[PDB]
Amino acid sequence: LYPEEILDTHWELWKKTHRKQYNNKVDEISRRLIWEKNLKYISIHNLEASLGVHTYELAMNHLGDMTSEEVVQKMTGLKVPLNDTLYIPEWEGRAPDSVDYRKKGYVTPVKNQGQCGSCWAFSSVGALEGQLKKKTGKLLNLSPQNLVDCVSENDGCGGGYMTNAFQYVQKNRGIDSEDAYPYVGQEESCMYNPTGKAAKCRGYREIPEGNEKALKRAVARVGPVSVAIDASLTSFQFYSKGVYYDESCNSDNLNHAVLAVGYGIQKGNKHWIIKNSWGENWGNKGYILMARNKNNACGIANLASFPKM
């Protein structure tokens, strides 16, 4: 096809705004055509939204010139795996109608992986940081690169699971801090340095498969929990605000690792407050509210786990 002459000035602005560069002008045109196709999806989606069709709206972000598949390919990293770990929570303790660890100082700044399937690393690091604060009272930026370069059971930027990350930290008797082992985004030879140790782990616990109720209690009593979801949809790729819910979200197509930092209600829609790894320039300042209690949307309660420390 041909680019829409109207959006010329816009494409240039978008490229500038996101440090987007293209090797060949051919390469560029091809991208420009994807960006434009997406813009249409976004614009028409928002129309349906105003017509009461969706509980959320979309927006053009830094993933504008990428197809959903490319995003799932280059920007996820969850590898589904194949007794003493369960945590079927009891009912009595606490069941606050709403919880938001961002306010309690348990959550660290939204970070950005990008071009490396290290989401598992970030989710693990996310849960650990929540516990570090809950225990020591200090909120530190732990090192995901440490996990990427050292969790041998995981394929580094090729992907992996959170459990293995937890187990590693335990058997390694420690995990570095972001400062002691900065995220470079690429796979490297393990360089875990004892000096920069900043947290430890004494096991892990898994939330009953597909049990949102159990997951709620878990988030309420333990704190932030690592969860896996299906992020293969364009609606998710361009989420801007609102309660995310898409019937096309396959519960069995888990491919992303995010951090559940709380839950609540918004305009009559129950939801989980999720923290993503694609920088704060995506979603609502880095976060996304996902439909809670809606038949386990996107497999939200399928691979939940949190470190025991």
- Per rule CB under 8 A, is residue 237 in the interface with a copy of itself? no
- Per rule CB under 8 A, is residue 14 in the interface with a copy of itself? yes
Cβ atoms 143, 183 nearer than 8 A:
yes
- Per rule CB under 8 A, is residue 47 in the interface with a copy of itself? yes
Cβ atoms 133, 152 nearer than 8 A:
no
**Which residue bears the tokens 């892990």?**
204
The residue count for binding a copy of itself (CB under 8 A) is: 19
Residue type, 21: Q
Subset of 23-42 contacting a copy of itself (CB under 8 A): 39
- Per rule CB under 8 A, is residue 122 in the interface with a copy of itself? no
- Per rule CB under 8 A, is residue 48 in the interface with a copy of itself? yes
From candidates 8, 27, 30, 43, binder to a copy of itself by CB under 8 A: 43
- Per rule CB under 8 A, is residue 88 in the interface with a copy of itself? no
Residue of 119, 150, 157, 298 marked active site = 119
- Per rule CB under 8 A, is residue 190 in the interface with a copy of itself? no
- Per rule CB under 8 A, is residue 278 in the interface with a copy of itself? no
| Alpha carbons 189 and 103: distance in angstroms, whole number | 37
Cα 119 to Cα 51, 165, 194, 212, 284, distances in angstroms: 35, 11, 24, 22, 18
Subset of 52-71 contacting a copy of itself (CB under 8 A): 52-53, 59-61
Strands 239-244 and 197-199: unpaired
Rg from Cα positions in the chain: 20
- Per rule CB under 8 A, is residue 82 in the interface with a copy of itself? no
Q: Cβ of residue 13: shortest distance to a copy of itself, in angstroms?
A: 5
Q: Is 256 a catalytic residue?
A: yes
Eight-class DSSP state of 178: G
- Per rule CB under 8 A, is residue 46 in the interface with a copy of itself? yes
Cβ atoms 157, 147 nearer than 8 A:
no
Cβ atoms 115, 185 nearer than 8 A:
yes
- Per rule CB under 8 A, is residue 1 in the interface with a copy of itself? no
- Per rule CB under 8 A, is residue 13 in the interface with a copy of itself? yes
- Per rule CB under 8 A, is residue 226 in the interface with a copy of itself? no
Q: Cβ of residue 8: shortest distance to a copy of itself, in angstroms?
A: 12
Residue of 256, 269, 296, 302 marked active site = 256
Q: Cβ of residue 103: shortest distance to a copy of itself, in angstroms?
A: 19
Pick between residue 13 and residue 29 the one whose CB is nearest to a copy of itself: 13
Question: How buried is 226 (Cβ within 10 angstroms: 0-12 exposed, 13-18 middle, 19+ buried)?
Answer: buried
Spatial CA neighbour of 278 closest among 34, 101, 141, 110 = 110
Q: Cβ of residue 47: shortest distance to a copy of itself, in angstroms?
A: 6
Residue 5 CB neighbour total at 10 angstroms = 7
Question: How buried is 239 (Cβ within 10 angstroms: 0-12 exposed, 13-18 middle, 19+ buried)?
Answer: buried
Q: Is 119 a catalytic residue?
A: yes
* Terminal-to-terminal C-alpha distance of the chain: 56
Q: Cβ of residue 6: shortest distance to a copy of itself, in angstroms?
A: 7
Element (H, E) at 11: helix 8-17
Q: Cβ of residue 64: shortest distance to a copy of itself, in angstroms?
A: 10
**Residues engaged in binding a copy of itself (CB under 8 A):** 6-7, 10, 13-14, 17, 39, 43-44, 46-48, 50-53, 59-61
Positions marked active-site: 119, 256, 276
